Design a protein around this ligand. Structure first.
Ligand SMILES: *[C@@H]1O[C@H](CO)[C@@H](O[C@@H]2O[C@H](CO)[C@@H](O[C@@H]3O[C@H](CO)[C@@H](O)[C@H](O)[C@@H]3O)[C@H](O)[C@H]2NC(C)=O)[C@H](O)[C@H]1NC(C)=O
Ligand SMILES: *[C@@H]1O[C@H](CO)[C@@H](O[C@@H]2O[C@H](CO)[C@@H](O[C@@H]3O[C@H](CO)[C@@H](O)[C@H](O)[C@@H]3O)[C@H](O)[C@H]2NC(C)=O)[C@H](O)[C@H]1NC(C)=O
Ligand SMILES: *[C@@H]1O[C@H](CO)[C@@H](O)[C@H](O)[C@H]1NC(C)=O
Ligand SMILES: *[C@@H]1O[C@H](CO)[C@@H](O)[C@H](O)[C@H]1NC(C)=O
Lengths: 236, 99, 90
């Protein structure tokens, strides 16, 4: 982005409107991430994953639309994609890539979950929590200790907490690894958490900003913003 | 054949509780390092004047109990407490391994 | 129901069909159509069909309000494929 004259602009609307039977009505980008071999686009009319990037065949990205039962247009406009930015250059056999998608919903008879995560071929999206209820703001897979970190916040209460659960055969489990860390009641609203790229530091942000070394068993506040929330973060 | 008694170590630091501090210290790589110095006796007609050090490293261990969590719970560090024949005074210096 | 000719547990085991999204307010406007035909000696060319017709709208998750399925009622497929008329009965 050193010059505005070299930023080339593309419209992808034909490729998107292909997979969707008829023609709906408001296909804006809502989020997008770029993994080491894949492109994941969350638009207002659904979530699309590129086939692959290492094998050119037709000189045009072919996008496959994920299945989410029911979620309409009002469920995709409120939706976030979380990804851990990690470079897998020489590609050891134990390194994989995960992506989490989080909505804000009501719990229909057709779903129940509002939080899904998937492995490197982004086809099988399975829920992040399994069998009043807390809402998963952010679920993150950490590979240093082979665990999954949830940022929960029960509605109708100021209670916010973080739970780390061990992973069994690539699926998170009940019975947390160590007892959960409960944030103070002054934490008004959280908005997510991030891993600093190629590191083991955790950052919870929202009305306040907290940092954790190690896995996420203990946090320490570094900032308070009364009635003010951070909206986005950039790091290098 | 073993000595009786162990030395049990944790650390405390204001603003937080002991157990989560020990859990964090274990999860970040910390391990206590212990240095024991023995003092000679007054009777040099029955024992020799020599003064001895021994340097050890404390081993982590879990407290047996209910343990609601899967992996980690109340956690402590343990080392044996050795004493030699000819002394009654020992100085134990605890410090960190740098991590 | 699972099947009726093979009793195993002295209790009907019921399996619930998949319909994406349809909520409670779409099941209250719905009809089952079945052709009453007696297949006593069960010749090999005789099969059984059931149609379900709904009174709902047209979401981004569906499109159809008319499905039909064959004798093992597991794969429910739409009755009309590729302003738009409404199917009262198929
Ligand atoms: C960290 O280490 C300290 C000492 O090395 C531990 O503190 C000790 O904790 C025990 C609890 O089992 C206390 O025992 C109590 O003593 C009273 C009176 O003797 C008795 O009525 C109680 O039923 C209980 O047995 C002990 O007093 C206490 N010592 C000190 C100096 O505070 C501490 O528990 C360790 N932390 C962790 C997380 O294990
Ligand atoms: C202080 O000095 C005394 C004297 O040497 C030490 O006690 C002696 O320790 C040895 C080895 O631990 C004992 O030998 C063993 O005795 C048992 C019991 O009969 C026998 O079954 C074994 O085969 C072996 O011979 C020896 O008996 C014991 N002396 C006495 C009088 O009991 C002691 O260890 C020294 N203190 C420290 C802290 O080292
Ligand atoms: C859940 O439903 C209520 C009303 O039924 C609605 O006001 C609320 O916005 C819904 N929750 C979310 C996350 O949108
Ligand atoms: C579509 O929704 C409208 C009201 O929003 C309703 O009148 C109509 O019954 C629905 N479509 C049909 C033809 O069932």
């Amino acid at each position: 982005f050193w010059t505005y004259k070299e930023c080339i602009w593309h419209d992808l609307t034909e490729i998107i409107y292909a997979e969707l039977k008829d023609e709906h009505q408001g296909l804006t980008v809502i989020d997008l991430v770029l993994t080491n071999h894949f492109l994941v686009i969350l638009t207002s009319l659904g979530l699309y994953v590129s086939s692959d990037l290492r094998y050119p065949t037709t000189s045009q990205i072919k996008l496959s639309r994920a299945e989410f039962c029911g979620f309409e247009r009002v469920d995709y406009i409120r939706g976030n994609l979380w990804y851990n930015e990690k470079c897998f250059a020489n590609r050891e056999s134990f390194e994989v890539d995960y992506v989490t998608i989080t909505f804000n919903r009501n719990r229909t008879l057709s779903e129940s979950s509002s939080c899904f995560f998937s492995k490197e071929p982004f086809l099988h999206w399975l829920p992040c929590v399994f069998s009043s209820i807390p809402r998963v703001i952010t679920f993150l897979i950490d590979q240093e200790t082979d665990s999954g970190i949830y940022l929960f916040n029960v509605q109708d209460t100021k209670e916010t907490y973080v739970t780390v659960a061990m992973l069994k055969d690539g699926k998170p489990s009940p019975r947390p690894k160590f007892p959960s860390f409960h944030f103070p009641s002054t934490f008004t609203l959280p908005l997510g958490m991030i891993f600093h790229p190629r590191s083991h530091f955790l950052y919870v942000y929202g009305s306040q900003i907290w940092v954790s070394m190690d896995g996420g068993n203990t946090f320490e506040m570094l900032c308070n913003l009364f009635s003010h929330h951070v909206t986005k973060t950039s790091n290098s | 054949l073993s000595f009786p008694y162990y030395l049990q170590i944790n650390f405390s630091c204001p603003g937080q509780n002991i157990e989560e501090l020990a859990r964090k210290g274990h999860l970040m790589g910390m391990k206590p390092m212990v240095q024991i110095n023995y003092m000679y006796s007054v009777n040099f007609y029955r024992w020799e004047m020599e003064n001895v050090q021994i340097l050890m490293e404390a081993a982590p261990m879990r407290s047996t109990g209910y343990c609601p969590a899967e992996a980690m719970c109340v956690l402590n560090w343990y080392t044996p407490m050795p004493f030699k024949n000819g002394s009654v005074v020992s100085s134990v210096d605890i410090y960190t391994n740098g991590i």
